[PDB]
């Protein structure tokens, strides 16, 4: 208990929620500041399942700002619940 873990839940608006295809996009959307953690295959709409891509940060820096940056032009179809957090203090 001491690591800061964030959580980004991305979900495609279309019923063609390609989770595995999103997997590749997830890696490229990850904050260039640190590294990822572990993703979650959780459902949202009637059949649209999102992926909660968490990230493990600690010795890193505020370079994770790149995440919000990529959000300014991220999956326009797959809007993310970019409000999840997990402060493991």
N, CA, C and O atoms as CSV, one atom per row, in Angstrom:
chain,resi,resn,atom,element,x,y,z
A,1,UNK,N,N,0.839,-1.227,0.000
A,1,UNK,CA,C,0.000,0.000,0.000
A,1,UNK,C,C,0.860,1.257,0.000
A,1,UNK,O,O,1.436,1.626,1.023
A,2,UNK,N,N,0.941,1.911,-1.155
A,2,UNK,CA,C,1.731,3.126,-1.270
A,2,UNK,C,C,1.816,3.621,-2.700
A,2,UNK,O,O,2.309,4.718,-2.961
A,3,UNK,N,N,1.330,2.803,-3.626
A,3,UNK,CA,C,1.351,3.139,-5.044
A,3,UNK,C,C,0.085,3.880,-5.460
A,3,UNK,O,O,-0.997,3.614,-4.937
A,4,UNK,N,N,0.223,4.808,-6.401
A,4,UNK,CA,C,-0.926,5.550,-6.911
A,4,UNK,C,C,-1.434,4.928,-8.209
A,4,UNK,O,O,-0.749,4.969,-9.231
A,5,UNK,N,N,-2.633,4.354,-8.166
A,5,UNK,CA,C,-3.208,3.709,-9.342
A,5,UNK,C,C,-4.421,4.473,-9.869
A,5,UNK,O,O,-5.389,4.693,-9.142
A,6,UNK,N,N,-4.360,4.873,-11.138
A,6,UNK,CA,C,-5.477,5.558,-11.782
A,6,UNK,C,C,-6.298,4.557,-12.587
A,6,UNK,O,O,-5.854,3.430,-12.806
A,7,UNK,N,N,-7.489,4.955,-13.028
A,7,UNK,CA,C,-8.330,4.054,-13.808
A,7,UNK,C,C,-9.072,4.782,-14.929
A,7,UNK,O,O,-9.749,5.787,-14.709
A,8,UNK,N,N,-8.917,4.239,-16.134
A,8,UNK,CA,C,-9.515,4.794,-17.343
A,8,UNK,C,C,-10.421,3.756,-18.023
A,8,UNK,O,O,-9.930,2.784,-18.596
A,9,UNK,N,N,-11.740,3.966,-17.958
A,9,UNK,CA,C,-12.703,3.012,-18.523
A,9,UNK,C,C,-13.192,3.428,-19.906
A,9,UNK,O,O,-14.111,4.238,-20.028
A,10,UNK,N,N,-12.579,2.877,-20.940
A,10,UNK,CA,C,-12.935,3.227,-22.315
A,10,UNK,C,C,-14.015,2.293,-22.871
A,10,UNK,O,O,-13.944,1.077,-22.697
A,11,UNK,N,N,-15.014,2.875,-23.541
A,11,UNK,CA,C,-16.114,2.092,-24.101
A,11,UNK,C,C,-16.611,2.682,-25.433
A,11,UNK,O,O,-16.962,3.860,-25.496
A,12,UNK,N,N,-16.640,1.855,-26.499
A,12,UNK,CA,C,-17.084,2.271,-27.838
A,12,UNK,C,C,-18.591,2.498,-27.906
A,12,UNK,O,O,-19.376,1.636,-27.509
A,13,UNK,N,N,-18.987,3.663,-28.410
A,13,UNK,CA,C,-20.398,4.009,-28.536
A,13,UNK,C,C,-21.145,2.992,-29.394
A,13,UNK,O,O,-22.309,2.686,-29.134
A,14,UNK,N,N,-20.471,2.472,-30.413
A,14,UNK,CA,C,-21.077,1.507,-31.323
A,14,UNK,C,C,-21.114,0.111,-30.708
A,14,UNK,O,O,-20.299,-0.202,-29.839
A,15,UNK,N,N,-22.059,-0.741,-31.154
A,15,UNK,CA,C,-22.185,-2.113,-30.651
A,15,UNK,C,C,-21.030,-2.996,-31.107
A,15,UNK,O,O,-20.940,-4.164,-30.731
A,16,UNK,N,N,-20.149,-2.423,-31.921
A,16,UNK,CA,C,-18.976,-3.132,-32.406
A,16,UNK,C,C,-17.809,-2.903,-31.458
A,16,UNK,O,O,-16.685,-2.636,-31.883
A,17,UNK,N,N,-18.099,-3.014,-30.167
A,17,UNK,CA,C,-17.102,-2.795,-29.125
A,17,UNK,C,C,-15.977,-3.829,-29.204
A,17,UNK,O,O,-15.949,-4.786,-28.431
A,18,UNK,N,N,-15.056,-3.629,-30.140
A,18,UNK,CA,C,-13.916,-4.525,-30.287
A,18,UNK,C,C,-12.965,-4.362,-29.108
A,18,UNK,O,O,-12.108,-3.479,-29.109
A,19,UNK,N,N,-13.123,-5.218,-28.105
A,19,UNK,CA,C,-12.304,-5.146,-26.903
A,19,UNK,C,C,-10.829,-5.388,-27.219
A,19,UNK,O,O,-9.958,-4.679,-26.715
A,20,UNK,N,N,-10.554,-6.388,-28.052
A,20,UNK,CA,C,-9.180,-6.730,-28.398
A,20,UNK,C,C,-8.564,-5.660,-29.283
A,20,UNK,O,O,-7.374,-5.365,-29.177
A,21,UNK,N,N,-9.375,-5.082,-30.155
A,21,UNK,CA,C,-8.902,-3.998,-31.003
A,21,UNK,C,C,-8.629,-2.770,-30.149
A,21,UNK,O,O,-7.679,-2.025,-30.387
A,22,UNK,N,N,-9.482,-2.577,-29.152
A,22,UNK,CA,C,-9.333,-1.479,-28.207
A,22,UNK,C,C,-8.073,-1.672,-27.380
A,22,UNK,O,O,-7.458,-0.708,-26.923
A,23,UNK,N,N,-7.697,-2.933,-27.194
A,23,UNK,CA,C,-6.510,-3.289,-26.427
A,23,UNK,C,C,-5.280,-2.598,-26.995
A,23,UNK,O,O,-4.481,-2.021,-26.258
A,24,UNK,N,N,-5.138,-2.664,-28.313
A,24,UNK,CA,C,-4.010,-2.040,-28.989
A,24,UNK,C,C,-4.070,-0.526,-28.835
A,24,UNK,O,O,-3.056,0.123,-28.580
A,25,UNK,N,N,-5.268,0.028,-28.991
A,25,UNK,CA,C,-5.462,1.467,-28.861
A,25,UNK,C,C,-5.212,1.914,-27.427
A,25,UNK,O,O,-4.759,3.032,-27.180
A,26,UNK,N,N,-5.514,1.027,-26.492
A,26,UNK,CA,C,-5.327,1.310,-25.079
A,26,UNK,C,C,-3.857,1.564,-24.770
A,26,UNK,O,O,-3.519,2.484,-24.026
A,27,UNK,N,N,-2.991,0.743,-25.347
A,27,UNK,CA,C,-1.559,0.875,-25.128
A,27,UNK,C,C,-1.052,2.219,-25.635
A,27,UNK,O,O,-0.201,2.849,-25.007
A,28,UNK,N,N,-1.580,2.651,-26.774
A,28,UNK,CA,C,-1.157,3.911,-27.376
A,28,UNK,C,C,-1.777,5.109,-26.666
A,28,UNK,O,O,-1.269,6.226,-26.758
A,29,UNK,N,N,-2.875,4.871,-25.959
A,29,UNK,CA,C,-3.572,5.937,-25.253
A,29,UNK,C,C,-3.042,6.095,-23.829
A,29,UNK,O,O,-3.348,7.077,-23.152
A,30,UNK,N,N,-2.247,5.125,-23.379
A,30,UNK,CA,C,-1.682,5.164,-22.031
A,30,UNK,C,C,-0.808,6.403,-21.830
A,30,UNK,O,O,-0.036,6.763,-22.719
A,31,UNK,N,N,-0.921,7.062,-20.661
A,31,UNK,CA,C,-0.114,8.241,-20.336
A,31,UNK,C,C,1.378,7.985,-20.527
A,31,UNK,O,O,1.973,7.167,-19.825
A,32,UNK,N,N,1.974,8.693,-21.484
A,32,UNK,CA,C,3.397,8.549,-21.791
A,32,UNK,C,C,4.287,8.868,-20.589
A,32,UNK,O,O,5.513,8.847,-20.701
A,33,UNK,N,N,3.677,9.162,-19.445
A,33,UNK,CA,C,4.449,9.500,-18.263
A,33,UNK,C,C,4.949,8.280,-17.517
A,33,UNK,O,O,6.105,8.235,-17.096
A,34,UNK,N,N,4.082,7.285,-17.349
A,34,UNK,CA,C,4.452,6.065,-16.640
A,34,UNK,C,C,4.065,4.822,-17.443
A,34,UNK,O,O,4.293,4.763,-18.652
A,35,UNK,N,N,3.482,3.835,-16.767
A,35,UNK,CA,C,3.077,2.593,-17.416
A,35,UNK,C,C,1.679,2.183,-16.976
A,35,UNK,O,O,1.120,2.752,-16.038
A,36,UNK,N,N,1.120,1.193,-17.660
A,36,UNK,CA,C,-0.219,0.707,-17.346
A,36,UNK,C,C,-0.204,-0.163,-16.091
A,36,UNK,O,O,0.832,-0.318,-15.444
A,37,UNK,N,N,-1.363,-0.727,-15.755
A,37,UNK,CA,C,-1.500,-1.576,-14.578
A,37,UNK,C,C,-2.202,-2.881,-14.923
A,37,UNK,O,O,-1.571,-3.929,-15.057
A,38,UNK,N,N,-3.516,-2.795,-15.062
A,38,UNK,CA,C,-4.341,-3.953,-15.361
A,38,UNK,C,C,-5.725,-3.498,-15.822
A,38,UNK,O,O,-6.365,-2.676,-15.167
A,39,UNK,N,N,-6.179,-4.037,-16.951
A,39,UNK,CA,C,-7.456,-3.633,-17.531
A,39,UNK,C,C,-8.612,-4.518,-17.069
A,39,UNK,O,O,-8.407,-5.652,-16.636
A,40,UNK,N,N,-9.828,-3.984,-17.167
A,40,UNK,CA,C,-11.028,-4.701,-16.744
A,40,UNK,C,C,-12.042,-4.813,-17.875
A,40,UNK,O,O,-12.355,-3.824,-18.539
A,41,UNK,N,N,-12.553,-6.017,-18.092
A,41,UNK,CA,C,-13.566,-6.248,-19.115
A,41,UNK,C,C,-14.964,-6.095,-18.523
A,41,UNK,O,O,-15.685,-7.077,-18.351
A,42,UNK,N,N,-15.338,-4.859,-18.213
A,42,UNK,CA,C,-16.635,-4.590,-17.606
A,42,UNK,C,C,-17.620,-4.014,-18.616
A,42,UNK,O,O,-17.220,-3.285,-19.523
A,43,UNK,N,N,-18.916,-4.339,-18.465
A,43,UNK,CA,C,-19.958,-3.895,-19.379
A,43,UNK,C,C,-20.561,-2.556,-18.987
A,43,UNK,O,O,-20.498,-2.145,-17.829
A,44,UNK,N,N,-21.147,-1.884,-19.972
A,44,UNK,CA,C,-21.738,-0.570,-19.758
A,44,UNK,C,C,-23.183,-0.522,-20.246
A,44,UNK,O,O,-24.118,-0.695,-19.463
A,45,UNK,N,N,-23.357,-0.287,-21.543
A,45,UNK,CA,C,-24.686,-0.210,-22.138
A,45,UNK,C,C,-25.382,-1.569,-22.111
A,45,UNK,O,O,-25.127,-2.387,-21.227
A,46,UNK,N,N,-26.260,-1.803,-23.082
A,46,UNK,CA,C,-26.989,-3.062,-23.164
A,46,UNK,C,C,-26.067,-4.197,-23.596
A,46,UNK,O,O,-26.290,-5.356,-23.247
A,47,UNK,N,N,-25.031,-3.856,-24.357
A,47,UNK,CA,C,-24.089,-4.861,-24.820
A,47,UNK,C,C,-22.700,-4.304,-25.074
A,47,UNK,O,O,-21.826,-5.013,-25.573
A,48,UNK,N,N,-22.490,-3.035,-24.734
A,48,UNK,CA,C,-21.194,-2.395,-24.942
A,48,UNK,C,C,-20.320,-2.506,-23.697
A,48,UNK,O,O,-20.554,-1.822,-22.700
A,49,UNK,N,N,-19.313,-3.373,-23.763
A,49,UNK,CA,C,-18.412,-3.596,-22.636
A,49,UNK,C,C,-17.167,-2.720,-22.727
A,49,UNK,O,O,-16.476,-2.703,-23.746
A,50,UNK,N,N,-16.892,-1.995,-21.649
A,50,UNK,CA,C,-15.733,-1.116,-21.580
A,50,UNK,C,C,-14.547,-1.813,-20.932
A,50,UNK,O,O,-14.688,-2.873,-20.323
A,51,UNK,N,N,-13.380,-1.201,-21.072
A,51,UNK,CA,C,-12.159,-1.727,-20.488
A,51,UNK,C,C,-11.562,-0.712,-19.520
A,51,UNK,O,O,-11.199,0.396,-19.915
A,52,UNK,N,N,-11.464,-1.097,-18.253
A,52,UNK,CA,C,-10.925,-0.215,-17.228
A,52,UNK,C,C,-9.421,-0.392,-17.117
A,52,UNK,O,O,-8.930,-1.245,-16.378
A,53,UNK,N,N,-8.702,0.429,-17.866
A,53,UNK,CA,C,-7.252,0.368,-17.906
A,53,UNK,C,C,-6.626,1.204,-16.797
A,53,UNK,O,O,-6.547,2.428,-16.895
A,54,UNK,N,N,-6.185,0.528,-15.743
A,54,UNK,CA,C,-5.544,1.193,-14.619
A,54,UNK,C,C,-4.064,1.398,-14.900
A,54,UNK,O,O,-3.510,0.794,-15.819
A,55,UNK,N,N,-3.425,2.252,-14.108
A,55,UNK,CA,C,-2.010,2.549,-14.296
A,55,UNK,C,C,-1.278,2.648,-12.958
A,55,UNK,O,O,-1.768,3.274,-12.018
A,56,UNK,N,N,-0.104,2.025,-12.880
A,56,UNK,CA,C,0.697,2.060,-11.660
A,56,UNK,C,C,1.759,3.151,-11.733
A,56,UNK,O,O,2.649,3.104,-12.582
A,57,UNK,N,N,1.661,4.132,-10.840
A,57,UNK,CA,C,2.625,5.227,-10.802
A,57,UNK,C,C,3.154,5.443,-9.388
A,57,UNK,O,O,2.443,5.219,-8.409
A,58,UNK,N,N,4.404,5.881,-9.290
A,58,UNK,CA,C,5.010,6.117,-7.992
A,58,UNK,C,C,6.306,6.895,-8.096
A,58,UNK,O,O,6.377,8.055,-7.691
A,59,UNK,N,N,7.335,6.254,-8.640
A,59,UNK,CA,C,8.634,6.895,-8.808
A,59,UNK,C,C,8.644,7.764,-10.059
A,59,UNK,O,O,9.614,8.474,-10.326
A,60,UNK,N,N,7.557,7.700,-10.819
A,60,UNK,CA,C,7.424,8.481,-12.042
A,60,UNK,C,C,7.325,9.973,-11.740
A,60,UNK,O,O,7.890,10.455,-10.758
A,61,UNK,N,N,6.604,10.698,-12.592
A,61,UNK,CA,C,6.430,12.135,-12.423
A,61,UNK,C,C,5.065,12.577,-12.930
A,61,UNK,O,O,4.180,11.752,-13.157
A,62,UNK,N,N,4.902,13.884,-13.107
A,62,UNK,CA,C,3.649,14.409,-13.613
A,62,UNK,C,C,3.566,14.296,-15.121
A,62,UNK,O,O,2.719,14.925,-15.756
A,63,UNK,N,N,4.454,13.487,-15.692
A,63,UNK,CA,C,4.472,13.295,-17.130
A,63,UNK,C,C,3.281,12.503,-17.625
A,63,UNK,O,O,3.111,12.316,-18.830
A,64,UNK,N,N,2.450,12.035,-16.697
A,64,UNK,CA,C,1.264,11.269,-17.058
A,64,UNK,C,C,0.197,12.193,-17.629
A,64,UNK,O,O,-0.864,11.743,-18.063
A,65,UNK,N,N,0.492,13.490,-17.625
A,65,UNK,CA,C,-0.412,14.489,-18.180
A,65,UNK,C,C,-0.751,14.150,-19.621
A,65,UNK,O,O,-1.784,14.562,-20.148
A,66,UNK,N,N,0.140,13.394,-20.246
A,66,UNK,CA,C,-0.026,12.993,-21.638
A,66,UNK,C,C,-1.348,12.262,-21.846
A,66,UNK,O,O,-1.895,12.258,-22.948
A,67,UNK,N,N,-1.855,11.646,-20.784
A,67,UNK,CA,C,-3.120,10.927,-20.859
A,67,UNK,C,C,-4.248,11.878,-21.231
A,67,UNK,O,O,-4.959,11.659,-22.212
A,68,UNK,N,N,-4.408,12.935,-20.441
A,68,UNK,CA,C,-5.428,13.939,-20.708
A,68,UNK,C,C,-5.221,14.555,-22.088
A,68,UNK,O,O,-6.182,14.897,-22.777
A,69,UNK,N,N,-3.956,14.693,-22.483
A,69,UNK,CA,C,-3.618,15.241,-23.790
A,69,UNK,C,C,-4.189,14.365,-24.895
A,69,UNK,O,O,-4.873,14.849,-25.797
A,70,UNK,N,N,-3.900,13.071,-24.813
A,70,UNK,CA,C,-4.396,12.110,-25.786
A,70,UNK,C,C,-5.915,12.034,-25.732
A,70,UNK,O,O,-6.558,11.586,-26.681
A,71,UNK,N,N,-6.481,12.477,-24.614
A,71,UNK,CA,C,-7.926,12.463,-24.426
A,71,UNK,C,C,-8.586,13.541,-25.276
A,71,UNK,O,O,-9.740,13.407,-25.683
A,72,UNK,N,N,-7.842,14.609,-25.539
A,72,UNK,CA,C,-8.335,15.712,-26.352
A,72,UNK,C,C,-8.601,15.258,-27.785
A,72,UNK,O,O,-9.244,15.965,-28.562
A,73,UNK,N,N,-8.101,14.073,-28.123
A,73,UNK,CA,C,-8.294,13.526,-29.455
A,73,UNK,C,C,-8.295,12.011,-29.444
A,73,UNK,O,O,-7.973,11.368,-30.443
A,74,UNK,N,N,-8.663,11.450,-28.301
A,74,UNK,CA,C,-8.701,10.004,-28.117
A,74,UNK,C,C,-9.888,9.384,-28.860
A,74,UNK,O,O,-10.476,10.016,-29.738
A,75,UNK,N,N,-10.233,8.148,-28.503
A,75,UNK,CA,C,-11.353,7.444,-29.120
A,75,UNK,C,C,-12.617,8.301,-29.101
A,75,UNK,O,O,-13.361,8.305,-28.120
A,76,UNK,N,N,-12.850,9.026,-30.193
A,76,UNK,CA,C,-14.022,9.878,-30.289
A,76,UNK,C,C,-15.312,9.088,-30.212
A,76,UNK,O,O,-16.346,9.607,-29.791
A,77,UNK,N,N,-15.247,7.826,-30.622
A,77,UNK,CA,C,-16.406,6.945,-30.580
A,77,UNK,C,C,-16.485,6.242,-29.234
A,77,UNK,O,O,-17.566,6.045,-28.680
A,78,UNK,N,N,-15.322,5.870,-28.720
A,78,UNK,CA,C,-15.229,5.201,-27.437
A,78,UNK,C,C,-14.914,6.205,-26.339
A,78,UNK,O,O,-13.747,6.462,-26.042
A,79,UNK,N,N,-15.955,6.773,-25.734
A,79,UNK,CA,C,-15.749,7.730,-24.652
A,79,UNK,C,C,-15.397,6.987,-23.389
A,79,UNK,O,O,-15.999,5.964,-23.062
A,80,UNK,N,N,-14.422,7.509,-22.684
A,80,UNK,CA,C,-13.933,6.866,-21.494
A,80,UNK,C,C,-14.459,7.516,-20.227
A,80,UNK,O,O,-14.695,8.723,-20.180
A,81,UNK,N,N,-14.638,6.695,-19.202
A,81,UNK,CA,C,-14.999,7.184,-17.889
A,81,UNK,C,C,-13.709,7.547,-17.184
A,81,UNK,O,O,-13.277,6.880,-16.244
A,82,UNK,N,N,-13.106,8.625,-17.663
A,82,UNK,CA,C,-11.807,9.063,-17.194
A,82,UNK,C,C,-11.930,9.833,-15.882
A,82,UNK,O,O,-11.420,10.945,-15.745
A,83,UNK,N,N,-12.616,9.221,-14.928
A,83,UNK,CA,C,-12.805,9.819,-13.618
A,83,UNK,C,C,-12.511,8.818,-12.502
A,83,UNK,O,O,-12.688,9.133,-11.325
A,84,UNK,N,N,-12.064,7.613,-12.864
A,84,UNK,CA,C,-11.789,6.592,-11.866
A,84,UNK,C,C,-10.384,6.738,-11.301
A,84,UNK,O,O,-9.447,7.086,-12.019
A,85,UNK,N,N,-10.248,6.468,-10.010
A,85,UNK,CA,C,-8.965,6.586,-9.333
A,85,UNK,C,C,-8.836,5.568,-8.202
A,85,UNK,O,O,-9.834,5.065,-7.688
A,86,UNK,N,N,-7.596,5.274,-7.824
A,86,UNK,CA,C,-7.318,4.324,-6.755
A,86,UNK,C,C,-6.039,4.706,-6.023
A,86,UNK,O,O,-4.960,4.201,-6.332
A,87,UNK,N,N,-6.170,5.599,-5.054
A,87,UNK,CA,C,-5.026,6.065,-4.281
A,87,UNK,C,C,-4.623,5.044,-3.223
A,87,UNK,O,O,-5.099,5.093,-2.088
A,88,UNK,N,N,-3.744,4.120,-3.599
A,88,UNK,CA,C,-3.268,3.100,-2.672
A,88,UNK,C,C,-2.157,3.654,-1.792
A,88,UNK,O,O,-0.975,3.449,-2.069
A,89,UNK,N,N,-2.542,4.358,-0.731
A,89,UNK,CA,C,-1.576,4.950,0.186
A,89,UNK,C,C,-1.259,4.000,1.337
A,89,UNK,O,O,-0.459,4.335,2.211
